[PDB]
Design a protein around this ligand. Sequence first.
Ligand code: CLA
Ligand code: CLA
Ligand code: CLA
Ligand code: KC2
Ligand SMILES: CC1=CCCC(C)(C)[C@H]1/C=C/C(C)=C/C=C/C(C)=C/C=C/C=C(C)/C=C/C=C(C)/C=C/C1=C(C)CCCC1(C)C
Lengths: 173, 183
Amino acid sequence: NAMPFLERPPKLDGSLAGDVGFDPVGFSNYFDLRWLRESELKHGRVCMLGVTGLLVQEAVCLPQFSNGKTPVDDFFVVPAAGLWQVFFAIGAVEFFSHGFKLTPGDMFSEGREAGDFGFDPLNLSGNPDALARRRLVEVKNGRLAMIAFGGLLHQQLLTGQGTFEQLANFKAI
Amino acid sequence: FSESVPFLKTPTNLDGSLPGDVGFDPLGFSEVFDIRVLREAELKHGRIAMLATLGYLVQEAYVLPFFEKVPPIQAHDALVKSGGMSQILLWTSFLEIFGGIALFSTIQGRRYPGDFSFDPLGLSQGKNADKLEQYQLAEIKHSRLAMLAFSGFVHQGFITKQGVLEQLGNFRPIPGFPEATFF
Ligand code: CLA
Ligand code: CLA
Ligand code: CLA
Ligand code: KC2
Ligand SMILES: CC1=CCCC(C)(C)[C@H]1/C=C/C(C)=C/C=C/C(C)=C/C=C/C=C(C)/C=C/C=C(C)/C=C/C1=C(C)CCCC1(C)C
């Protein structure tokens, strides 16, 4: 296990992917595991997209936009009206995907498993074994994306330099 | 009577169950509090003291190329304002949250006090379990020794303004005392 000196969490069973028994506090003991897994998948997917955005906006800038010194500054140079529609379009996407069941009690009522919405433009989710492998890869890369996005954002905020450009010259503080 | 102290009795709940039990508990600490919680505290103190003693020796002997060469107390003072001490505190606290979780597991029986199953190398894990208790004894002894040694170090550094290797090389008395003349 992840904590050999501790015991396995009671609510934690190996049904979900990425289960290593890592829950030293009892978040799963006090909150629904389906809700926690949905939040984990949402954070991980948002962080994958954020990592790609941080690595791309330093290299590619839209012609109808101003290119800031860093992607964090790319956020600032965008007009606030664009940021607000981004916010409200994401909110509309949340409303459509959750079926107007934002509250934790209303969510997971009509099955939906945990963190599943229905998204397969290309059918790569047929066989259950490959589906489970894809789930494990997805959750691991999502957690790695959370850590990596935190690191990239904070290093960009501190040094004021892009990630690849920071790799060009370290400039230790 | 107690083994360590001939004129005292064996301190009740103090037997060979825990390593290094010479019956030394003149004040009833093992009766006011659980003996396993006290053993966890002793192991934490001793391990931190061993690391601190080794760090004192090496820092007096050697310094990294990206750190200012200063006495260890001056190193603490300099890196408090530099942020390195903040980093050490943050990561140590992050580990010690899970350490406290393990301690709470220890309180309700279960895991052995001070045992984290930490063994990157094959030492007393498999094929060497028969030495494990021996190792345990050695560990606590070193712990206790370190808990004294580091202490002496710093207080000697407080009285002579010298490193421990400097005091070993040049064992001059307490400053101002060779002149004496107190009357
Ligand atoms: C917010 C993101 C998020 C969420 C909701 C979850 C949720 C979950 N994880 Mg995942 N996980 C995450 C991020 C997240 N994780 C990251 C970033 C990593 C990489 C280290 C992991 C690695 C991981 C493993 C290896 C495992 C889980 C498991 C689980 C499940 C049980 C544990 C739990 O309840 O944690 C709840 C977690 C939170 C509520 C987030 C923590 C919030 C605290 C209060 C803030 C402190 C965190 C901070 C960033 C650390 C600072 C450190 C300091 C030195 C600066 C649950 C579904 C286990 C599982 O599959 O069980 C089903 C399992 O085995 N997770
Ligand atoms: C967490 C995710 C995230 C966030 C908050 C932002 C936010 C922002 N981006 Mg970045 N970006 C992202 C991801 C993200 N981006 C990704 C993944 C890419 C690679 C395609 C880019 C590439 C990119 C460029 C090239 C530029 C920005 C720019 C901007 C700013 C203006 C908004 C805009 O034009 O959107 C642009 C959005 C896109 C090009 C694509 C939308 C991002 C994802 C794919 C939407 C997800 C929706 C849906 C759930 C996914 C399903 C579809 C899937 C098959 C992909 C704003 C600060 C501009 C800027 O200010 O730079 C100066 C700009 O020029 N972004
Ligand atoms: C692994 C995560 C991690 C990260 C990202 C950082 C980040 C940082 N630490 Mg470190 N630190 C960590 C863990 C980490 N710390 C741990 C576990 C300890 C022991 C308790 C310390 C002890 C420590 C001390 C004592 C000091 C710092 C300092 C710093 C800061 C200055 C960075 C620097 O020297 O320039 C950039 C770094 C370099 C030039 C060194 C080379 C690093 C290489 C290139 C990167 C290698 C990978 C890197 C270690 C990431 C590891 C994780 C990754 C493998 C996933 C920076 C914010 C210093 C500070 O506060 O600033 C004044 C400082 O004095 N840290
Ligand atoms: C969240 C997804 C999203 C949706 C679903 C969506 C729908 C529509 C529709 C549909 C009915 C129209 C007709 C429309 C038109 C304009 N959008 Mg657009 N839009 C979205 C995203 C963004 C962002 C991120 C920005 C943005 C902007 C503008 C400007 C500004 C030009 C000007 O400066 O006058 C105009 C005219 C920018 C802005 O508002 O700030 C300056 C800006 O950054 N939009 N938009
Ligand atoms: C709106 C907003 C505000 C201001 C402007 C803005 C910046 C553009 C924007 C962005 C805001 C944003 C999006 C800000 C984003 C902030 C983020 C994502 C911060 C992430 C922090 C993650 C940390 C410290 C992880 C540490 C990992 C550890 C200790 C790993 C531990 C590990 C574990 C547990 C397991 C194994 C052992 C080890 C390896 C030890």
